[PDB]
Amino acid sequence: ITXISLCA
């Protein structure tokens, strides 16, 4: 979740 999409 969270970074699951695109954040890193």
Q: How many CA atoms lie within 13 A of 6 on its CB side?
A: 0
Distance CA 3, CA 6 (A): 5
- Residue 5, token pair as written in the block: 């999409």
| Residue tagged 């999409």 (tokens) | 5
How many CA atoms lie less than 13 Å away from 1 in the CB half-sphere? 0
CA separation for the pair 1, 8 (Å, rounded)? 12
Q: How was this structure obtained?
A: NMR
- DSSP-assigned letters across all residues of 1-8: --TTSS--
